[PDB]
Amino acid sequence: KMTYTPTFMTSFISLEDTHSVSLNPIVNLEENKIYGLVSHNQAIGIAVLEKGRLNGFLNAHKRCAYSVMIGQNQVLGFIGTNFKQELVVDFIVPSAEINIGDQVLTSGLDGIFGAGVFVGEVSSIEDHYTYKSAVLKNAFLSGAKLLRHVFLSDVKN
Amino acid sequence: KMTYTPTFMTSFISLEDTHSVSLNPIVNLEENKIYGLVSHNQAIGIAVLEKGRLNGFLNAHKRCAYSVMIGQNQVLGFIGTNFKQELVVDFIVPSAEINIGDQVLTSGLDGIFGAGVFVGEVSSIEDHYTYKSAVLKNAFLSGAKLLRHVFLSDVK
Amino acid sequence: RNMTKKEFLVPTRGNITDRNDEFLATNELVFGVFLPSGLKQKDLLEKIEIIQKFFPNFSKETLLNNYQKENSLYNHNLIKVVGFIPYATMQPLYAKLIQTQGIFALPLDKRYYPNNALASHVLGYVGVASLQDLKDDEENQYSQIVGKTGIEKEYNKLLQGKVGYKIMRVNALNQELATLEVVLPSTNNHLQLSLDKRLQKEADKLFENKRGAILVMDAENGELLVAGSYPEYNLNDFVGGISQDKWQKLQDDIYNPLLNRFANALYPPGSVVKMGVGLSFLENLHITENTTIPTPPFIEVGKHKFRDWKKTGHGNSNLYKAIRESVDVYFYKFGLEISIEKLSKTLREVGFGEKTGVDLPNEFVGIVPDNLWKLKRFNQDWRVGDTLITAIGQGSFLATPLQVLAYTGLIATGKLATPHFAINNKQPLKDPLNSFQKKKLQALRVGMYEVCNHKDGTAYHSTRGSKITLACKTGTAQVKDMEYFHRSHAWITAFLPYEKPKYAITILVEHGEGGSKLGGLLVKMSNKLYELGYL
């Protein structure tokens, strides 16, 4: 079981960072629980309540991380980012079969998002020997349309 | 919701530049809230009430910054400036597709401006690896004239 | 100018594969929670409290102990606080760990043996580099994962691969700029073995309540399709260090699970040597395969009587029949007339003195007892009785199941296979026989044929129900009313198919109480090879 509740941004946190936003408070959330953020049927980032302030850390922020699955065999990884602020799936098993263009969806195993929400598509693949990474394309980054109409993802803990 | 309230520039604050102006007081504003400034249906800078004075920090000023969106995909950045005092959109992800000539509008997400107010057009783009910047043309440059019909942008 | 920065590129330890590309040994991607080295005692405590929350199944203090310990990483910085975390366990934790600024969670490899105790004595296991291991091969340091036993050890260099490195320009923020140098790591580190996973599972099934060892071998090139040693043990219990509880269980198991019985265990061969002994007679004396002599229940020579295994005795008998019926006196009699120097030469030529050359560590050589050997060990003379008891594979005679196997494939083939596990180990056949000896081989084969197929044969009542024609020799080695540990051990070796030999099989059941009793196990393996199309 799971809830989507609407929310909206009041401002960016810094004016030197597009990946961090202040969100309008939402009645009885838990503090420090990590919530998912969804816009146009897509994952845009996560949200945490800290000292009474609801903060959104968007895709490619240092603090934005969550569990995703790739392709029809649901290959698992974790969302991070890199020095060029590209959205990356990290920590994939080296034996896994991934193809350029494979859909990437939330895995729904992290208690942040439910399963099956769209994230992006695999554009390239790095070998790091003990694991592989996948750089995404068609994922939310810098796009202003999806910062409106935003829903908070509350997965019952 | 959003409001425009009129005011006008009375004098320049600094004797070293045209980037900073005094505005005619406006009743019941909140102190330290950052408001947007608009003139001929264009973004010219921002305004803050501090210690009873309504101060306008125009496009080129070190303190003037706000959120804008570029082109049809509404790519996000922030207004700043550079070493040659050009008006710049800064903080753009390097993987974004923006082109010379793209319209630049206020994003309306910053609580300063509403969306869609005109800022300028992209004239060039510098790639800095970690980010890119876009230098603007046809933007309001903070010049010699003290404008009479400026409106303050109050987003609630 | 500025300054530069180095980063090693450490390849994942190579996979071990079955004949048909099944996984025998592989790696599992797991996690590890790390804290930076050189931290204040006050702060360190507060961070361990945080890590306590995420792993409530560990104690606030067991995590102190882990901090300063003989673990660590390959890096100039970071210390492993919790290790071996399953991917699924990390699933709700990864994001929460990311929220705390000075806490890192990193991907690690843990070795994994999918089949557990299958072929445990072939594959062997990897462990933490001992301080002596780092000395042995300086390059063991970048992984801290080295083979301890068996194939993991024998082929460590291969499986581990070569490190590469990457040197980079950096700024004060210690971020990466230009790559200045790259050397890539090795990649094809995998290893394919000749075992067949199905055939080994059969082998395990056959030794289900038994101790001993079993071997199947392609007699034309030396590939081992089976190599069981029983009890086997579960390789996964060693991977993260062995527990005090499981080490006791293995050490104090009286049946001795850690013992490799096909390569690192010695047993008296018994009657299995007889065709090697016979081959020496024919070579050194003035006699033939058809030389027939009287074979009573026993003989007397001086002060003592040398007894045949069954009371009744065995009438008149030649070489063919002495092999067939595992007859003792034929060999007693001609043993009187052969010098131990010449007999032992023939036995050592057919592969009983030395290592077969298997690609594992520490293969045992046997003892082919002779004159000079008894003198060096016991300082006692070589009485005729020694020649005689040796001519039936007992007394001071010891061999490995490997030796018997190689020996059996020499008889059947006419050339000597080096048994091996690594398919990419091109081991040429060896030709330690002269003209005369090779011709006499057929005689010997016909005998082995008769053991399994003639009605008088020792192994007739037991080796029926076989889809192919078999040729064998049984054996028994001294240590129904008899208590388990006093019982004689049991041998049976064999080649197949008789009409054109290709494979050899060699089976040994500890306390198997008689060699013929093992025909039911031989058929079952030879049928499994039929079932699976090897024949």
Side-chain angles (χ1 to χ4, degrees), chain C residues 279-308:
Chain C
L279 177 64
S280 195
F281 292 162
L282 297 166
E283 181 174 7
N284 290 300
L285 305 182
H286 297 84
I287 50 103
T288 66
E289 54 269 31
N290 311 296
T291 307
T292 314
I293 65 176
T295 300
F298 62 88
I299 58 168
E300 196 187 309
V301 174
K303 196 172 59 172
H304 291 142
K305 297 181 203 170
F306 295 82
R307 307 178 159 277
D308 187 294

Short mmCIF file of all heavy atoms in Angstrom, two decimals, chain C residues 279-308:
data_model
loop_
_atom_site.label_atom_id
_atom_site.label_comp_id
_atom_site.label_asym_id
_atom_site.label_seq_id
_atom_site.Cartn_x
_atom_site.Cartn_y
_atom_site.Cartn_z
N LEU C 279 53.14 -58.51 -16.25
CA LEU C 279 53.89 -57.93 -17.36
C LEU C 279 55.40 -58.01 -17.12
O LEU C 279 56.17 -58.20 -18.06
CB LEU C 279 53.45 -56.48 -17.63
CG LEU C 279 54.23 -55.75 -18.73
CD1 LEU C 279 54.02 -56.40 -20.08
CD2 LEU C 279 53.87 -54.28 -18.78
N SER C 280 55.81 -57.88 -15.87
CA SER C 280 57.21 -58.03 -15.51
C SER C 280 57.69 -59.48 -15.66
O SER C 280 58.80 -59.72 -16.13
CB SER C 280 57.45 -57.57 -14.07
OG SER C 280 58.84 -57.38 -13.81
N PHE C 281 56.87 -60.44 -15.25
CA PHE C 281 57.21 -61.85 -15.39
C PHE C 281 57.54 -62.17 -16.84
O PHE C 281 58.62 -62.69 -17.16
CB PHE C 281 56.05 -62.77 -14.98
CG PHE C 281 55.73 -62.75 -13.51
CD1 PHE C 281 54.51 -63.22 -13.07
CD2 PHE C 281 56.66 -62.31 -12.57
CE1 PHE C 281 54.19 -63.24 -11.73
CE2 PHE C 281 56.34 -62.33 -11.23
CZ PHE C 281 55.11 -62.80 -10.80
N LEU C 282 56.59 -61.86 -17.71
CA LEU C 282 56.70 -62.17 -19.13
C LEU C 282 57.91 -61.52 -19.75
O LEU C 282 58.47 -62.02 -20.72
CB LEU C 282 55.46 -61.68 -19.87
CG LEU C 282 54.12 -62.30 -19.49
CD1 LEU C 282 52.99 -61.46 -20.08
CD2 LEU C 282 54.06 -63.73 -19.99
N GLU C 283 58.30 -60.38 -19.19
CA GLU C 283 59.39 -59.60 -19.73
C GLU C 283 60.75 -60.14 -19.30
O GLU C 283 61.70 -60.18 -20.09
CB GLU C 283 59.20 -58.16 -19.28
CG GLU C 283 60.22 -57.16 -19.77
CD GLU C 283 59.84 -55.75 -19.39
OE1 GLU C 283 58.85 -55.57 -18.63
OE2 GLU C 283 60.54 -54.83 -19.84
N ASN C 284 60.83 -60.60 -18.05
CA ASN C 284 62.11 -60.92 -17.42
C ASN C 284 62.43 -62.41 -17.35
O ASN C 284 63.60 -62.80 -17.28
CB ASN C 284 62.14 -60.29 -16.03
CG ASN C 284 62.23 -58.78 -16.08
OD1 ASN C 284 63.20 -58.24 -16.62
ND2 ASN C 284 61.23 -58.09 -15.54
N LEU C 285 61.38 -63.23 -17.36
CA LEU C 285 61.54 -64.68 -17.25
C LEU C 285 61.47 -65.31 -18.65
O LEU C 285 61.34 -64.61 -19.65
CB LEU C 285 60.46 -65.25 -16.32
CG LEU C 285 60.37 -64.65 -14.91
CD1 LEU C 285 59.29 -65.35 -14.09
CD2 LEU C 285 61.70 -64.72 -14.17
N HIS C 286 61.59 -66.64 -18.70
CA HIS C 286 61.39 -67.41 -19.94
C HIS C 286 60.04 -68.13 -19.91
O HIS C 286 59.99 -69.36 -19.78
CB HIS C 286 62.49 -68.46 -20.11
CG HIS C 286 63.86 -67.88 -20.27
ND1 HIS C 286 64.64 -67.51 -19.20
CD2 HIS C 286 64.59 -67.64 -21.38
CE1 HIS C 286 65.80 -67.06 -19.64
NE2 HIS C 286 65.79 -67.12 -20.96
N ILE C 287 58.97 -67.35 -20.02
CA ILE C 287 57.59 -67.86 -19.90
C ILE C 287 56.62 -67.06 -20.78
O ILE C 287 57.01 -66.10 -21.44
CB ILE C 287 57.11 -67.88 -18.43
CG1 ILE C 287 57.35 -66.53 -17.74
CG2 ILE C 287 57.80 -69.00 -17.66
CD1 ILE C 287 56.11 -65.68 -17.59
N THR C 288 55.36 -67.49 -20.81
CA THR C 288 54.32 -66.81 -21.59
C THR C 288 52.98 -66.74 -20.85
O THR C 288 52.78 -67.34 -19.79
CB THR C 288 54.04 -67.48 -22.95
OG1 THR C 288 53.47 -68.78 -22.73
CG2 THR C 288 55.31 -67.60 -23.78
N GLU C 289 52.07 -65.98 -21.45
CA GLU C 289 50.71 -65.82 -20.95
C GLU C 289 50.02 -67.16 -20.76
O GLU C 289 49.16 -67.28 -19.90
CB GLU C 289 49.88 -64.88 -21.85
CG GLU C 289 49.81 -65.22 -23.34
CD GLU C 289 50.90 -64.56 -24.17
OE1 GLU C 289 52.02 -64.34 -23.65
OE2 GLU C 289 50.66 -64.30 -25.35
N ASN C 290 50.43 -68.17 -21.52
CA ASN C 290 49.80 -69.50 -21.48
C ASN C 290 50.50 -70.49 -20.57
O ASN C 290 49.98 -71.59 -20.35
CB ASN C 290 49.77 -70.08 -22.88
CG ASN C 290 49.22 -69.12 -23.88
OD1 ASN C 290 48.06 -68.74 -23.80
ND2 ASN C 290 50.04 -68.71 -24.83
N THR C 291 51.66 -70.13 -20.05
CA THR C 291 52.34 -70.96 -19.07
C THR C 291 51.38 -71.25 -17.93
O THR C 291 50.96 -70.35 -17.19
CB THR C 291 53.58 -70.26 -18.54
OG1 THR C 291 54.40 -69.85 -19.66
CG2 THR C 291 54.35 -71.19 -17.60
N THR C 292 51.03 -72.52 -17.82
CA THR C 292 50.06 -72.97 -16.83
C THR C 292 50.82 -73.69 -15.73
O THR C 292 51.73 -74.47 -16.01
CB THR C 292 49.03 -73.92 -17.48
OG1 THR C 292 48.57 -73.38 -18.72
CG2 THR C 292 47.84 -74.15 -16.55
N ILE C 293 50.46 -73.43 -14.48
CA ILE C 293 51.07 -74.11 -13.34
C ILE C 293 50.01 -74.45 -12.29
O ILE C 293 48.95 -73.82 -12.25
CB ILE C 293 52.19 -73.28 -12.69
CG1 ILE C 293 51.63 -71.98 -12.07
CG2 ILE C 293 53.27 -72.96 -13.72
CD1 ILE C 293 52.65 -71.13 -11.33
N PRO C 294 50.27 -75.45 -11.44
CA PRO C 294 49.31 -75.83 -10.39
C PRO C 294 49.15 -74.79 -9.27
O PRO C 294 50.12 -74.26 -8.76
CB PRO C 294 49.88 -77.16 -9.85
CG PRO C 294 51.30 -77.21 -10.29
CD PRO C 294 51.41 -76.39 -11.54
N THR C 295 47.90 -74.51 -8.91
CA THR C 295 47.57 -73.44 -7.96
C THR C 295 46.77 -73.97 -6.78
O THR C 295 45.53 -73.90 -6.77
CB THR C 295 46.80 -72.32 -8.67
OG1 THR C 295 47.60 -71.78 -9.72
CG2 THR C 295 46.44 -71.18 -7.71
N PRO C 296 47.47 -74.49 -5.76
CA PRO C 296 46.84 -74.96 -4.53
C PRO C 296 46.41 -73.83 -3.61
O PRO C 296 46.71 -72.66 -3.89
CB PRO C 296 47.94 -75.79 -3.88
CG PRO C 296 49.20 -75.21 -4.39
CD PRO C 296 48.91 -74.76 -5.79
N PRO C 297 45.71 -74.17 -2.50
CA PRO C 297 45.27 -73.18 -1.51
C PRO C 297 46.39 -72.33 -0.91
O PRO C 297 46.15 -71.23 -0.46
CB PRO C 297 44.62 -74.04 -0.41
CG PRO C 297 44.17 -75.26 -1.13
CD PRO C 297 45.21 -75.52 -2.19
N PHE C 298 47.61 -72.85 -0.91
CA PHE C 298 48.76 -72.13 -0.36
C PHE C 298 50.05 -72.71 -0.91
O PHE C 298 50.03 -73.68 -1.66
CB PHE C 298 48.74 -72.20 1.18
CG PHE C 298 48.87 -73.61 1.74
CD1 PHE C 298 50.12 -74.17 1.97
CD2 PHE C 298 47.73 -74.35 2.05
CE1 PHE C 298 50.23 -75.45 2.48
CE2 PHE C 298 47.83 -75.63 2.56
CZ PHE C 298 49.08 -76.18 2.78
N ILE C 299 51.18 -72.10 -0.54
CA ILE C 299 52.50 -72.72 -0.75
C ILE C 299 53.34 -72.57 0.52
O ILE C 299 53.05 -71.73 1.37
CB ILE C 299 53.28 -72.13 -1.94
CG1 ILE C 299 53.48 -70.63 -1.79
CG2 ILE C 299 52.54 -72.40 -3.24
CD1 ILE C 299 54.47 -70.05 -2.78
N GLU C 300 54.37 -73.41 0.64
CA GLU C 300 55.37 -73.24 1.69
C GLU C 300 56.70 -72.95 1.03
O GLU C 300 57.01 -73.52 -0.01
CB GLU C 300 55.50 -74.47 2.57
CG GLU C 300 56.24 -74.16 3.87
CD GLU C 300 56.53 -75.37 4.70
OE1 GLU C 300 55.59 -76.16 4.95
OE2 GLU C 300 57.69 -75.53 5.10
N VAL C 301 57.50 -72.08 1.65
CA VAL C 301 58.82 -71.75 1.10
C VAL C 301 59.95 -72.08 2.09
O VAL C 301 60.90 -72.80 1.73
CB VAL C 301 58.87 -70.29 0.62
CG1 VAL C 301 60.28 -69.91 0.20
CG2 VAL C 301 57.91 -70.10 -0.55
N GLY C 302 59.84 -71.61 3.33
CA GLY C 302 60.78 -72.02 4.36
C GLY C 302 60.05 -72.22 5.66
O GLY C 302 59.38 -73.23 5.86
N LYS C 303 60.18 -71.22 6.52
CA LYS C 303 59.54 -71.26 7.82
C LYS C 303 58.04 -70.92 7.71
O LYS C 303 57.28 -71.25 8.62
CB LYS C 303 60.25 -70.30 8.80
CG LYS C 303 59.93 -70.51 10.28
CD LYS C 303 60.81 -69.67 11.19
CE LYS C 303 60.66 -68.18 10.91
NZ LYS C 303 61.36 -67.33 11.91
N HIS C 304 57.62 -70.29 6.61
CA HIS C 304 56.24 -69.82 6.53
C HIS C 304 55.49 -70.17 5.25
O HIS C 304 56.10 -70.52 4.23
CB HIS C 304 56.19 -68.31 6.75
CG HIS C 304 56.52 -67.90 8.16
ND1 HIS C 304 57.25 -66.77 8.45
CD2 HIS C 304 56.18 -68.44 9.36
CE1 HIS C 304 57.36 -66.63 9.76
NE2 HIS C 304 56.72 -67.63 10.33
N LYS C 305 54.16 -70.08 5.36
CA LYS C 305 53.22 -70.43 4.28
C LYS C 305 52.47 -69.20 3.76
O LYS C 305 51.85 -68.46 4.53
CB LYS C 305 52.18 -71.43 4.77
CG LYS C 305 52.75 -72.78 5.18
CD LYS C 305 51.69 -73.75 5.64
CE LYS C 305 52.29 -74.81 6.55
NZ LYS C 305 51.23 -75.62 7.20
N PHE C 306 52.51 -69.02 2.45
CA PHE C 306 51.89 -67.86 1.80
C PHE C 306 50.54 -68.23 1.19
O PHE C 306 50.45 -68.96 0.18
CB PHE C 306 52.82 -67.28 0.74
CG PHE C 306 54.09 -66.72 1.31
CD1 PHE C 306 55.16 -67.55 1.60
CD2 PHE C 306 54.21 -65.36 1.58
CE1 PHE C 306 56.33 -67.05 2.13
CE2 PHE C 306 55.38 -64.85 2.12
CZ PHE C 306 56.44 -65.70 2.40
N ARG C 307 49.49 -67.72 1.81
CA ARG C 307 48.14 -68.22 1.59
C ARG C 307 47.39 -67.47 0.49
O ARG C 307 47.55 -66.25 0.33
CB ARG C 307 47.37 -68.14 2.90
CG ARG C 307 48.09 -68.84 4.05
CD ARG C 307 47.33 -68.70 5.35
NE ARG C 307 47.75 -69.75 6.28
CZ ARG C 307 47.27 -70.99 6.28
NH1 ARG C 307 46.34 -71.38 5.42
NH2 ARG C 307 47.73 -71.86 7.16
N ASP C 308 46.60 -68.22 -0.27
CA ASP C 308 45.70 -67.69 -1.31
C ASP C 308 44.41 -67.24 -0.66
O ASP C 308 44.02 -67.76 0.39
CB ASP C 308 45.43 -68.77 -2.38
CG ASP C 308 44.65 -68.24 -3.56
OD1 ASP C 308 43.47 -67.85 -3.38
OD2 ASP C 308 45.23 -68.23 -4.68
#
